[PDB]
Amino acid sequence: APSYRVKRMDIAKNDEECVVNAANPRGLPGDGVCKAVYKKWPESFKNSATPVGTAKTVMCGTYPVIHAVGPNFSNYSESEGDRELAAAYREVAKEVTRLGVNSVAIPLLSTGVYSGGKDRLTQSLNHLFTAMDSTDADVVIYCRDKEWEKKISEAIQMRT
Numbered sequence: 001a002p003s004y005r006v007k008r009m010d011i012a013k014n015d016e017e018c019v020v021n022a023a024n025p026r027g028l029p030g031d032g033v034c035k036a037v038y039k040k041w042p043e044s045f046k047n048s049a050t051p052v053g054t055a056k057t058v059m060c061g062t063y064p065v066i067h068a069v070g071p072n073f074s075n076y077s078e079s080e081g082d083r084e085l086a087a088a089y090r091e092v093a094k095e096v097t098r099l100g101v102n103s104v105a106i107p108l109l110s111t112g113v114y115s116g117g118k119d120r121l122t123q124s125l126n127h128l129f130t131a132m133d134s135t136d137a138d139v140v141i142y143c144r145d146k147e148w149e150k151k152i153s154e155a156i157q158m159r160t
Contacts, residue, residue, distance in 0.1 A: 004132060006141045006152050011107060012036055018096055018104035018137075020066040023048045024114070025075075031114070033107045034067065041065070052076060053084035055091035066095045070127075072114045085110065089127055093134035103138040106131070108152070121148075125155050 011019060011033055021034035027049045029035060038045040043058075044065045050056035052069045059065075068088045073081035096104045110127055111119035132139055143149035 002136055002138055004139050006143060006149060006156060008143050008149055009105060011105060011142065012040055014063060015105040016063050017101050018099060019063055020068060020092055020106045022070055022072065022109040023067045025049055025052060025069050025072055032109055037065065053087045055088055055095055057095045064099060066092055068092050068109065070109045071111060074114045089131040090134060093131040096137060097135050101137055103140065104135065105140055105142055107142050121151055
């Protein structure tokens with residue numbers, strides 16, 4: 001019987017079960033948790049360029065790195081951007097489920113990092129839930145700040 005949880009786990013452990021990152025489509029530095037992963041794994045960033053609207057898995061020797069292009073729609077409108085970001089989630093969930101892994105650690109993205117400087121706690125939640133609905137594996141949403149993690153936890157309590 002599958003489930004979901006929230007915790008705070010530094011992705012730089014290298015979660016063998018699955019790792020997902022948000023990388024700039026142009027391969028420029030100044031990006032999400034992908035920046036941190038890159039500093040451990042140069043090869044992950046090597047030709048990490050992938051178009052918006054998709055996801056690109058690469059295998060860095062050990063464990064697959066699913067690169068996704070969500071908030072990095074800064075070269076795109078809000079209307080198209082919602083569609084492309086949604087497609088990126090379906091691709092992420094599809095690669096995860098295809099790996100057929102027991103669990104998966106997914107960072108939350110869509111938090112304004114490259115777009116027009118706005119997060120949307122509700123938007124990130126709904127989007128993650130959509131991806132999650134498209135995965136059987138025991139998925140964990142991973143948070144960073146303590147108080148922001150708390151809000152996600154409130155959403156979990158509110159969604160049972």
